[PDB]
Design a protein around this ligand. Sequence first.
Ligand code: O64
Length: 217
Amino acid sequence: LPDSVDWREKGCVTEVKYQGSCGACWAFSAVGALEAQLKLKTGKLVSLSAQNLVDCSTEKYGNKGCNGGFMTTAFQYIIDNKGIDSDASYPYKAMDQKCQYDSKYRAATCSKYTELPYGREDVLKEAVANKGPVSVGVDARHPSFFLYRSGVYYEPSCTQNVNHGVLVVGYGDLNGKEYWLVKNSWGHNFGEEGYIRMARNKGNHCGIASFPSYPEI
Ligand SMILES: *C(=O)[C@H](CC)NC(=O)c1cccc(C(F)(F)F)c1Cl
Protein backbone atom coordinates (compact mmCIF):
# COMPACT_ATOMS: atom_id res chain seq x y z
CA LEU A 1 0.00 0.00 0.00
CA PRO A 2 1.05 3.65 -0.48
CA ASP A 3 2.73 5.27 2.54
CA SER A 4 0.30 8.23 2.27
CA VAL A 5 -3.07 8.91 0.60
CA ASP A 6 -5.14 12.12 0.27
CA TRP A 7 -8.46 11.80 -1.56
CA ARG A 8 -8.71 15.62 -1.82
CA GLU A 9 -5.88 15.40 -4.42
CA LYS A 10 -8.06 13.02 -6.47
CA GLY A 11 -11.11 15.39 -6.72
CA CYS A 12 -13.29 13.16 -4.48
CA VAL A 13 -13.90 15.38 -1.44
CA THR A 14 -16.42 18.25 -1.27
CA GLU A 15 -16.22 21.45 0.81
CA VAL A 16 -16.33 21.15 4.60
CA LYS A 17 -19.86 21.52 5.98
CA TYR A 18 -21.05 23.15 9.24
CA GLN A 19 -23.53 21.09 11.31
CA GLY A 20 -24.20 23.88 13.82
CA SER A 21 -26.33 22.94 16.83
CA CYS A 22 -27.74 19.78 15.20
CA GLY A 23 -25.99 16.42 15.89
CA ALA A 24 -25.97 15.41 12.23
CA CYS A 25 -22.29 14.35 12.11
CA TRP A 26 -23.45 10.82 11.19
CA ALA A 27 -25.33 12.20 8.16
CA PHE A 28 -22.38 14.28 6.98
CA SER A 29 -20.02 11.29 7.40
CA ALA A 30 -22.39 9.14 5.30
CA VAL A 31 -22.86 11.64 2.47
CA GLY A 32 -19.10 12.33 2.37
CA ALA A 33 -18.32 8.66 1.81
CA LEU A 34 -20.96 8.39 -0.92
CA GLU A 35 -19.84 11.67 -2.61
CA ALA A 36 -16.41 10.07 -3.30
CA GLN A 37 -18.02 6.97 -4.81
CA LEU A 38 -20.29 9.16 -6.98
CA LYS A 39 -17.19 10.99 -8.28
CA LEU A 40 -15.42 7.67 -9.05
CA LYS A 41 -18.46 6.28 -10.85
CA THR A 42 -19.72 9.32 -12.80
CA GLY A 43 -16.92 11.91 -12.78
CA LYS A 44 -19.03 14.48 -10.93
CA LEU A 45 -18.23 15.94 -7.50
CA VAL A 46 -21.54 16.92 -5.90
CA SER A 47 -22.47 17.63 -2.27
CA LEU A 48 -25.22 15.22 -1.23
CA SER A 49 -28.07 16.08 1.12
CA ALA A 50 -27.24 15.48 4.82
CA GLN A 51 -30.67 17.00 5.57
CA ASN A 52 -32.33 14.28 3.49
CA LEU A 53 -30.76 11.75 5.88
CA VAL A 54 -31.72 13.72 9.02
CA ASP A 55 -35.36 14.05 7.90
CA CYS A 56 -35.92 10.68 6.17
CA SER A 57 -33.49 8.11 7.63
CA THR A 58 -35.31 8.26 10.95
CA GLU A 59 -37.04 5.74 13.32
CA LYS A 60 -37.15 2.87 10.77
CA TYR A 61 -33.33 3.16 10.62
CA GLY A 62 -32.79 3.54 14.37
CA ASN A 63 -31.73 7.16 13.86
CA LYS A 64 -32.70 10.27 15.80
CA GLY A 65 -31.92 13.15 13.42
CA CYS A 66 -30.21 16.00 15.30
CA ASN A 67 -29.89 13.68 18.32
CA GLY A 68 -27.62 11.25 16.45
CA GLY A 69 -27.60 8.26 14.13
CA PHE A 70 -25.60 5.65 12.24
CA MET A 71 -23.76 5.95 8.93
CA THR A 72 -24.47 2.28 8.11
CA THR A 73 -28.25 2.61 8.53
CA ALA A 74 -28.08 5.89 6.57
CA PHE A 75 -26.54 3.91 3.65
CA GLN A 76 -29.31 1.30 3.94
CA TYR A 77 -31.90 4.12 3.79
CA ILE A 78 -30.39 5.31 0.48
CA ILE A 79 -30.44 1.73 -0.86
CA ASP A 80 -34.06 1.15 0.25
CA ASN A 81 -35.14 4.60 -0.92
CA LYS A 82 -33.47 4.13 -4.35
CA GLY A 83 -31.83 7.53 -3.96
CA ILE A 84 -30.61 10.56 -2.12
CA ASP A 85 -31.16 14.16 -3.21
CA SER A 86 -28.49 16.76 -3.95
CA ASP A 87 -27.56 19.19 -1.16
CA ALA A 88 -28.47 21.98 -3.63
CA SER A 89 -32.04 20.69 -3.93
CA TYR A 90 -32.39 19.75 -0.25
CA PRO A 91 -30.11 22.12 1.68
CA TYR A 92 -29.05 21.82 5.31
CA LYS A 93 -31.19 23.50 7.99
CA ALA A 94 -29.64 22.12 11.23
CA MET A 95 -32.98 20.94 12.52
CA ASP A 96 -35.25 17.90 12.42
CA GLN A 97 -37.90 18.16 9.71
CA LYS A 98 -40.55 16.10 7.99
CA CYS A 99 -39.14 13.98 5.14
CA GLN A 100 -39.11 16.02 1.90
CA TYR A 101 -37.29 13.55 -0.38
CA ASP A 102 -38.30 13.84 -4.03
CA SER A 103 -36.83 11.49 -6.65
CA LYS A 104 -36.84 14.38 -9.15
CA TYR A 105 -33.78 15.76 -7.25
CA ARG A 106 -31.94 12.41 -6.91
CA ALA A 107 -28.14 12.94 -7.13
CA ALA A 108 -26.90 9.48 -6.13
CA THR A 109 -27.82 5.91 -5.46
CA CYS A 110 -26.30 3.25 -3.21
CA SER A 111 -26.26 -0.51 -3.97
CA LYS A 112 -24.51 -1.86 -0.86
CA TYR A 113 -22.20 -1.00 2.00
CA THR A 114 -19.39 -2.80 3.79
CA GLU A 115 -18.55 -2.69 7.50
CA LEU A 116 -14.88 -3.27 8.23
CA PRO A 117 -13.79 -5.57 11.09
CA TYR A 118 -13.53 -4.09 14.55
CA GLY A 119 -10.28 -2.33 15.47
CA ARG A 120 -8.19 -3.35 12.46
CA GLU A 121 -6.26 -0.26 11.36
CA ASP A 122 -4.41 -2.22 8.65
CA VAL A 123 -7.72 -3.19 7.01
CA LEU A 124 -8.88 0.45 7.32
CA LYS A 125 -5.63 1.53 5.59
CA GLU A 126 -6.29 -0.89 2.73
CA ALA A 127 -9.85 0.42 2.28
CA VAL A 128 -8.76 4.07 2.27
CA ALA A 129 -5.98 3.27 -0.24
CA ASN A 130 -8.03 1.06 -2.55
CA LYS A 131 -11.76 1.82 -2.16
CA GLY A 132 -12.19 5.44 -1.08
CA PRO A 133 -12.93 7.60 1.97
CA VAL A 134 -14.35 5.58 4.82
CA SER A 135 -17.03 6.63 7.31
CA VAL A 136 -15.90 6.11 10.92
CA GLY A 137 -16.96 6.88 14.47
CA VAL A 138 -14.55 8.48 16.91
CA ASP A 139 -14.57 9.31 20.61
CA ALA A 140 -14.81 13.09 20.44
CA ARG A 141 -15.99 13.53 24.06
CA HIS A 142 -12.82 15.25 25.26
CA PRO A 143 -12.03 18.98 25.41
CA SER A 144 -8.79 18.45 23.43
CA PHE A 145 -10.85 17.43 20.37
CA PHE A 146 -12.81 20.72 20.50
CA LEU A 147 -9.57 22.66 21.08
CA TYR A 148 -7.58 20.92 18.35
CA ARG A 149 -5.77 23.31 16.00
CA SER A 150 -3.03 21.41 14.15
CA GLY A 151 -0.64 18.47 14.03
CA VAL A 152 -1.29 14.86 14.95
CA TYR A 153 -4.02 14.57 17.58
CA TYR A 154 -3.38 12.21 20.49
CA GLU A 155 -5.60 12.21 23.63
CA PRO A 156 -4.40 9.89 26.42
CA SER A 157 -7.98 9.80 27.88
CA CYS A 158 -9.54 8.67 24.58
CA THR A 159 -11.60 5.47 24.57
CA GLN A 160 -12.84 3.04 21.89
CA ASN A 161 -16.43 4.14 22.71
CA VAL A 162 -17.35 6.24 19.67
CA ASN A 163 -19.89 9.07 19.61
CA HIS A 164 -19.06 11.32 16.64
CA GLY A 165 -19.29 10.42 12.93
CA VAL A 166 -16.48 11.65 10.67
CA LEU A 167 -14.85 10.74 7.32
CA VAL A 168 -11.35 9.30 6.81
CA VAL A 169 -10.14 10.86 3.53
CA GLY A 170 -6.52 9.71 3.73
CA TYR A 171 -3.55 8.87 5.90
CA GLY A 172 0.14 9.62 6.20
CA ASP A 173 2.76 10.76 8.67
CA LEU A 174 4.06 14.05 10.04
CA ASN A 175 7.80 13.61 10.47
CA GLY A 176 7.16 9.87 11.10
CA LYS A 177 4.16 10.39 13.45
CA GLU A 178 1.43 8.40 11.67
CA TYR A 179 -2.04 9.78 11.23
CA TRP A 180 -5.49 9.40 9.70
CA LEU A 181 -6.66 12.44 7.71
CA VAL A 182 -10.19 13.13 8.95
CA LYS A 183 -12.86 15.42 7.46
CA ASN A 184 -15.14 16.81 10.22
CA SER A 185 -18.46 18.70 9.82
CA TRP A 186 -17.80 21.53 12.31
CA GLY A 187 -17.13 24.09 9.57
CA HIS A 188 -14.00 25.45 7.97
CA ASN A 189 -12.57 27.05 11.14
CA PHE A 190 -12.31 23.81 13.15
CA GLY A 191 -8.78 22.38 13.33
CA GLU A 192 -6.87 22.37 10.03
CA GLU A 193 -9.53 24.24 8.05
CA GLY A 194 -12.15 21.62 8.87
CA TYR A 195 -9.81 18.62 9.09
CA ILE A 196 -8.12 16.81 11.96
CA ARG A 197 -5.12 14.48 11.71
CA MET A 198 -5.67 11.71 14.29
CA ALA A 199 -3.07 9.28 15.66
CA ARG A 200 -2.80 6.11 13.52
CA ASN A 201 -1.43 2.70 14.57
CA LYS A 202 -1.66 3.81 18.21
CA GLY A 203 -3.95 1.03 19.45
CA ASN A 204 -7.16 2.09 17.71
CA HIS A 205 -6.86 5.55 19.17
CA CYS A 206 -10.23 7.23 19.96
CA GLY A 207 -11.91 4.16 18.33
CA ILE A 208 -11.15 5.42 14.82
CA ALA A 209 -11.12 1.80 13.51
CA SER A 210 -13.96 0.60 15.77
CA PHE A 211 -16.84 1.04 13.30
CA PRO A 212 -15.69 1.87 9.78
CA SER A 213 -17.90 1.54 6.73
CA TYR A 214 -18.06 2.52 3.08
CA PRO A 215 -20.84 2.51 0.45
CA GLU A 216 -20.86 1.58 -3.20
CA ILE A 217 -22.99 3.30 -5.81
C1 O64 B 1 -22.53 13.95 16.06
O1 O64 B 1 -23.01 15.07 15.29
C2 O64 B 1 -23.72 13.21 16.70
C3 O64 B 1 -24.12 13.92 17.99
C4 O64 B 1 -25.36 13.31 18.61
N1 O64 B 1 -23.27 11.87 17.09
C5 O64 B 1 -23.76 10.74 16.55
O2 O64 B 1 -24.62 10.74 15.69
C6 O64 B 1 -23.29 9.39 17.01
C7 O64 B 1 -23.59 8.99 18.31
C8 O64 B 1 -23.18 7.73 18.76
C9 O64 B 1 -22.48 6.88 17.91
C10 O64 B 1 -22.18 7.28 16.60
C11 O64 B 1 -21.43 6.38 15.65
F1 O64 B 1 -21.12 5.24 16.24
F2 O64 B 1 -22.19 6.09 14.61
F3 O64 B 1 -20.33 6.97 15.23
C12 O64 B 1 -22.60 8.53 16.16
CL1 O64 B 1 -22.21 9.04 14.49
